[PDB]
Design a protein around this motif. Structure first.
Motif, PDB file in Angstrom:
ATOM      1  N   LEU A 211      -6.687 -13.982  -9.134  1.00  0.00           N
ATOM      2  CA  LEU A 211      -5.488 -13.163  -8.975  1.00  0.00           C
ATOM      3  C   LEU A 211      -5.813 -11.679  -9.000  1.00  0.00           C
ATOM      4  CD1 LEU A 211      -3.006 -13.145 -12.043  1.00  0.00           C
ATOM      5  CD2 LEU A 211      -5.312 -13.861 -12.319  1.00  0.00           C
ATOM      6  N   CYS A 212      -7.084 -11.321  -9.185  1.00  0.00           N
ATOM      7  CA  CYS A 212      -7.489  -9.944  -8.933  1.00  0.00           C
ATOM      8  C   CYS A 212      -7.201  -9.521  -7.496  1.00  0.00           C
ATOM      9  CB  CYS A 212      -8.975  -9.773  -9.243  1.00  0.00           C
ATOM     10  SG  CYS A 212      -9.517  -8.061  -9.393  1.00  0.00           S
ATOM     11  N   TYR A 213      -7.048 -10.474  -6.575  1.00  0.00           N
ATOM     12  CA  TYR A 213      -6.654 -10.197  -5.198  1.00  0.00           C
ATOM     13  C   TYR A 213      -5.146 -10.258  -4.982  1.00  0.00           C
ATOM     14  CZ  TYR A 213     -11.606 -11.087  -4.461  1.00  0.00           C
ATOM     15  OH  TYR A 213     -12.977 -11.053  -4.521  1.00  0.00           O
ATOM     16  N   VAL A 214      -4.369 -10.558  -6.026  1.00  0.00           N
ATOM     17  CA  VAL A 214      -2.923 -10.567  -5.869  1.00  0.00           C
ATOM     18  C   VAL A 214      -2.405  -9.168  -5.558  1.00  0.00           C
ATOM     19  CG1 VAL A 214      -0.753 -10.956  -7.133  1.00  0.00           C
ATOM     20  CG2 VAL A 214      -2.519 -12.680  -7.137  1.00  0.00           C
ATOM     21  N   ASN A 215      -3.167  -8.124  -5.889  1.00  0.00           N
ATOM     22  CA  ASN A 215      -2.833  -6.787  -5.404  1.00  0.00           C
ATOM     23  C   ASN A 215      -2.822  -6.753  -3.880  1.00  0.00           C
ATOM     24  OD1 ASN A 215      -2.572  -3.970  -5.007  1.00  0.00           O
ATOM     25  ND2 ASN A 215      -4.797  -3.707  -5.137  1.00  0.00           N
ATOM     26  N   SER A 216      -3.900  -7.246  -3.267  1.00  0.00           N
ATOM     27  CA  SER A 216      -3.980  -7.292  -1.816  1.00  0.00           C
ATOM     28  C   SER A 216      -2.904  -8.192  -1.231  1.00  0.00           C
ATOM     29  CB  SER A 216      -5.367  -7.767  -1.385  1.00  0.00           C
ATOM     30  OG  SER A 216      -5.444  -7.921   0.020  1.00  0.00           O
ATOM     31  N   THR A 217      -2.552  -9.267  -1.933  1.00  0.00           N
ATOM     32  CA  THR A 217      -1.461 -10.113  -1.450  1.00  0.00           C
ATOM     33  C   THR A 217      -0.121  -9.385  -1.509  1.00  0.00           C
ATOM     34  OG1 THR A 217      -0.863 -11.148  -3.556  1.00  0.00           O
ATOM     35  CG2 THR A 217      -2.766 -12.050  -2.370  1.00  0.00           C
ATOM     36  N   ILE A 218       0.145  -8.688  -2.615  1.00  0.00           N
ATOM     37  CA  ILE A 218       1.463  -8.115  -2.865  1.00  0.00           C
ATOM     38  C   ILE A 218       1.732  -6.931  -1.948  1.00  0.00           C
ATOM     39  CG2 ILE A 218       2.643  -6.641  -4.536  1.00  0.00           C
ATOM     40  CD1 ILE A 218       2.097  -8.649  -6.668  1.00  0.00           C
ATOM     41  N   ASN A 219       0.738  -6.057  -1.759  1.00  0.00           N
ATOM     42  CA  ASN A 219       0.989  -4.793  -1.064  1.00  0.00           C
ATOM     43  C   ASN A 219       1.669  -4.941   0.295  1.00  0.00           C
ATOM     44  OD1 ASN A 219      -0.351  -3.982  -3.329  1.00  0.00           O
ATOM     45  ND2 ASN A 219      -2.035  -2.938  -2.273  1.00  0.00           N
ATOM     46  N   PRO A 220       1.202  -5.786   1.224  1.00  0.00           N
ATOM     47  CA  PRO A 220       1.910  -5.877   2.514  1.00  0.00           C
ATOM     48  C   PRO A 220       3.356  -6.323   2.380  1.00  0.00           C
ATOM     49  CG  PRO A 220       0.355  -7.676   2.272  1.00  0.00           C
ATOM     50  CD  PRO A 220       0.053  -6.704   1.178  1.00  0.00           C
ATOM     51  N   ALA A 221       3.650  -7.216   1.433  1.00  0.00           N
ATOM     52  CA  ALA A 221       5.032  -7.634   1.222  1.00  0.00           C
ATOM     53  C   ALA A 221       5.835  -6.549   0.518  1.00  0.00           C
ATOM     54  CB  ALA A 221       5.072  -8.937   0.425  1.00  0.00           C
ATOM     55  N   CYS A 222       5.240  -5.903  -0.488  1.00  0.00           N
ATOM     56  CA  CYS A 222       5.938  -4.846  -1.209  1.00  0.00           C
ATOM     57  C   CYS A 222       6.258  -3.657  -0.315  1.00  0.00           C
ATOM     58  CB  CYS A 222       5.107  -4.390  -2.409  1.00  0.00           C
ATOM     59  SG  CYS A 222       6.036  -3.458  -3.643  1.00  0.00           S
ATOM     60  N   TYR A 223       5.484  -3.455   0.754  1.00  0.00           N
ATOM     61  CA  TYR A 223       5.786  -2.385   1.701  1.00  0.00           C
ATOM     62  C   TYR A 223       7.186  -2.551   2.276  1.00  0.00           C
ATOM     63  CZ  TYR A 223       0.839  -1.116   1.619  1.00  0.00           C
ATOM     64  OH  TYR A 223      -0.416  -0.710   1.237  1.00  0.00           O
ATOM     65  N   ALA A 224       7.495  -3.748   2.780  1.00  0.00           N
ATOM     66  CA  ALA A 224       8.830  -4.005   3.304  1.00  0.00           C
ATOM     67  C   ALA A 224       9.848  -4.180   2.187  1.00  0.00           C
ATOM     68  CB  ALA A 224       8.813  -5.240   4.207  1.00  0.00           C
ATOM     69  N   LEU A 225       9.411  -4.663   1.020  1.00  0.00           N
ATOM     70  CA  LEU A 225      10.342  -4.864  -0.086  1.00  0.00           C
ATOM     71  C   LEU A 225      10.918  -3.540  -0.574  1.00  0.00           C
ATOM     72  CD1 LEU A 225       9.839  -7.365  -2.994  1.00  0.00           C
ATOM     73  CD2 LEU A 225      10.649  -5.060  -3.484  1.00  0.00           C
ATOM     74  N   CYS A 226      10.090  -2.498  -0.650  1.00  0.00           N
ATOM     75  CA  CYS A 226      10.541  -1.223  -1.194  1.00  0.00           C
ATOM     76  C   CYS A 226      11.008  -0.249  -0.118  1.00  0.00           C
ATOM     77  CB  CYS A 226       9.425  -0.578  -2.020  1.00  0.00           C
ATOM     78  SG  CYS A 226       9.941   0.893  -2.932  1.00  0.00           S
ATOM     79  N   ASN A 227      10.319  -0.196   1.018  1.00  0.00           N
ATOM     80  CA  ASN A 227      10.640   0.753   2.076  1.00  0.00           C
ATOM     81  C   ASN A 227      11.695   0.149   2.997  1.00  0.00           C
ATOM     82  OD1 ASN A 227      10.111   1.767   5.043  1.00  0.00           O
ATOM     83  ND2 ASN A 227       9.375   3.399   3.691  1.00  0.00           N
TER      84      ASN A 227
ATOM     85  N   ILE B  51      -1.995  -2.082 -10.905  1.00  0.00           N
ATOM     86  CA  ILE B  51      -2.349  -2.149 -12.319  1.00  0.00           C
ATOM     87  C   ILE B  51      -2.033  -3.528 -12.887  1.00  0.00           C
ATOM     88  CG2 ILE B  51      -0.154  -1.130 -13.059  1.00  0.00           C
ATOM     89  CD1 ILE B  51      -1.720   0.158 -15.367  1.00  0.00           C
ATOM     90  N   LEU B  52      -0.885  -4.103 -12.521  1.00  0.00           N
ATOM     91  CA  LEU B  52      -0.516  -5.414 -13.038  1.00  0.00           C
ATOM     92  C   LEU B  52      -1.507  -6.479 -12.596  1.00  0.00           C
ATOM     93  CD1 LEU B  52       1.641  -7.199 -14.508  1.00  0.00           C
ATOM     94  CD2 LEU B  52       2.721  -7.464 -12.267  1.00  0.00           C
ATOM     95  N   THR B  53      -1.960  -6.414 -11.343  1.00  0.00           N
ATOM     96  CA  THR B  53      -2.886  -7.428 -10.853  1.00  0.00           C
ATOM     97  C   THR B  53      -4.277  -7.255 -11.450  1.00  0.00           C
ATOM     98  OG1 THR B  53      -3.169  -6.027  -8.919  1.00  0.00           O
ATOM     99  CG2 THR B  53      -1.642  -7.869  -8.746  1.00  0.00           C
ATOM    100  N   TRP B  54      -4.759  -6.018 -11.558  1.00  0.00           N
ATOM    101  CA  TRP B  54      -6.125  -5.793 -12.010  1.00  0.00           C
ATOM    102  C   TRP B  54      -6.261  -5.695 -13.524  1.00  0.00           C
ATOM    103  CZ3 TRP B  54     -10.996  -4.695  -9.594  1.00  0.00           C
ATOM    104  CH2 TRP B  54     -11.002  -4.927  -8.213  1.00  0.00           C
ATOM    105  N   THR B  55      -5.157  -5.695 -14.269  1.00  0.00           N
ATOM    106  CA  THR B  55      -5.257  -5.631 -15.726  1.00  0.00           C
ATOM    107  C   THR B  55      -5.986  -6.822 -16.339  1.00  0.00           C
ATOM    108  OG1 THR B  55      -3.259  -4.263 -15.839  1.00  0.00           O
ATOM    109  CG2 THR B  55      -3.932  -5.408 -17.841  1.00  0.00           C
TER     110      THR B  55
ATOM    111  N   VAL C 181     -17.383  -2.491  -2.632  1.00  0.00           N
ATOM    112  CA  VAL C 181     -17.185  -1.142  -2.118  1.00  0.00           C
ATOM    113  C   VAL C 181     -15.770  -0.966  -1.582  1.00  0.00           C
ATOM    114  CG1 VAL C 181     -18.004  -1.509   0.252  1.00  0.00           C
ATOM    115  CG2 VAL C 181     -18.293   0.700  -0.844  1.00  0.00           C
ATOM    116  N   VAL C 182     -15.198  -1.996  -0.949  1.00  0.00           N
ATOM    117  CA  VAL C 182     -13.839  -1.838  -0.440  1.00  0.00           C
ATOM    118  C   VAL C 182     -12.827  -1.859  -1.579  1.00  0.00           C
ATOM    119  CG1 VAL C 182     -14.422  -2.724   1.840  1.00  0.00           C
ATOM    120  CG2 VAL C 182     -13.594  -4.295   0.077  1.00  0.00           C
ATOM    121  N   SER C 183     -13.089  -2.620  -2.647  1.00  0.00           N
ATOM    122  CA  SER C 183     -12.216  -2.550  -3.814  1.00  0.00           C
ATOM    123  C   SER C 183     -12.232  -1.151  -4.418  1.00  0.00           C
ATOM    124  CB  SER C 183     -12.637  -3.591  -4.850  1.00  0.00           C
ATOM    125  OG  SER C 183     -12.465  -4.904  -4.347  1.00  0.00           O
ATOM    126  N   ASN C 184     -13.427  -0.582  -4.587  1.00  0.00           N
ATOM    127  CA  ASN C 184     -13.512   0.778  -5.110  1.00  0.00           C
ATOM    128  C   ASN C 184     -12.878   1.779  -4.151  1.00  0.00           C
ATOM    129  OD1 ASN C 184     -16.657  -0.258  -6.325  1.00  0.00           O
ATOM    130  ND2 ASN C 184     -14.862   0.170  -7.596  1.00  0.00           N
TER     131      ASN C 184
END
Lengths: 280, 65
Positions: A252-268, A221-225, A89-92
């Motif tokens: 690695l379906c959870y690599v989305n969850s891994t990437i997002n907190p780091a990508c927040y500072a990486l892009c913003n 999309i890259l992680t869940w593909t 449910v949290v993934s959805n």
């Protein structure tokens, strides 16, 4: 040297990933609630996605590891069903959150007067709660109740799978819908946003927000593909795919969850400068 | 005798393997919280001790629907 060292390696790396996801999500949302210089709906959506991200990361990876460390569910069941329903449910919910972020950005870009002052902060929280409750009432009661609809918990006390995923048709339908429908909606909305922004063209901050949304979408999309690719492959023949590759893919379906907190500072940029301050 | 050789999103496929492998073993092997690989086939041994892969025997005309 043979198996124990590999088990220690896997357990340690999964624990490190869980810890880094947890700390990243908590630090980014603490920065959100402490800085108080930001009051945009996109940042509230980011907060909700980060909360879902920490829940996914911590609970899902911890329980998936204690499930994969031996090959069964060590706990006395009961917790299995609750954790499975929560994870799915949290993934959805994260998928729908990214969906509604894309809707909001497309609406804002395509019309300068799309009631932009109607949003304020109440609308963002209302949309977040609506997506969360929709995902909940759509998936969780079904998970908890269709097992009783069949008649009994056919899942053994040591296994932790989903009842309706036994039917291949249910697997195919849920995968295609709940992945590619959001994916195609992201694709068309990204094209529309790009063309509208090009036609229309503060600009630096708008480009930063657009890049942040694009990075989140690309990471997801890259992680869940691969998971959905293999799910489709299982619809080509029977047992087209081995088991350890399935384990790694859903890992690695959870690599989305891994990437997002780091990508927040990486892009913003503001997140990047806040990260150094909040590490201390 | 007849047994459903597999399951697919389209439908079932009943088959009649010859007097060789006169047994229908049906197996569930749970690989992911969201994936349980399934087999239904012909073999010539009923006991089949399991490596955490639930299996059952069948020798009828519709037993592994």
């Amino acid at each position: 040297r043979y198996e124990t060292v590999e088990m220690v390696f896997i357990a340690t790396v999964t624990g490190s990933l869980s810890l880094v996801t947890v700390v990243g999500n908590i630090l980014v949302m603490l920065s959100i609630k402490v800085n108080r210089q930001l009051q945009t709906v996109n940042n509230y959506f980011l907060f909700s996605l980060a909360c879902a991200d920490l829940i996914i990361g911590a609970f899902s990876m911890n329980l998936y590891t204690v499930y994969i460390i031996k090959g069964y569910w060590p706990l006395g069941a009961v917790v299995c069903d609750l954790w499975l329903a929560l994870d799915y449910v949290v993934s959805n919910a994260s998928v729908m959150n990214l969906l509604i972020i894309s809707f909001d950005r497309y609406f804002c870009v395509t019309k300068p007067l799309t009631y932009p002052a109607r949003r304020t902060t109440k609308m963002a929280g209302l949309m977040i709660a609506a997506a969360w409750v929709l995902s909940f009432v759509l998936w969780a009661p079904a998970i908890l109740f269709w097992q009783f609809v069949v008649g009994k918990r056919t899942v053994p006390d040591n296994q932790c799978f989903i009842q309706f995923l036994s039917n291949p048709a249910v697997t195919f339908g849920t995968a295609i819908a709940a992945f590619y429908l959001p994916v195609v909606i992201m694709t068309v909305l990204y094209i529309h946003i790009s063309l509208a922004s090009r036609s229309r063209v503060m600009a630096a901050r708008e480009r930063k927000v657009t890049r942040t949304i694009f990075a989140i979408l690309l990471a997801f999309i890259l992680t869940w593909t691969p998971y959905n690719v293999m799910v489709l492959v299982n619809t080509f023949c029977q047992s087209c795919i081995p088991d350890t590759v399935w384990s790694i893919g859903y890992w690695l379906c959870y690599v989305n969850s891994t990437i997002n907190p780091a990508c927040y500072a990486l892009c913003n940029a503001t997140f990047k400068k806040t990260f150094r301050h909040l590490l201390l | 005798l007849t047994c459903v050789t597999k399951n697919t999103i389209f439908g079932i496929t009943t088959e009649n393997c010859p007097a060789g492998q006169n047994l229908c073993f049906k197996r569930w092997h749970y690989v992911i919280p969201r994936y349980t690989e399934i087999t239904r086939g012909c073999a010539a041994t009923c006991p089949i001790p399991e490596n955490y892969d639930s299996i059952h025997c069948c020798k009828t005309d519709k037993c592994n629907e």
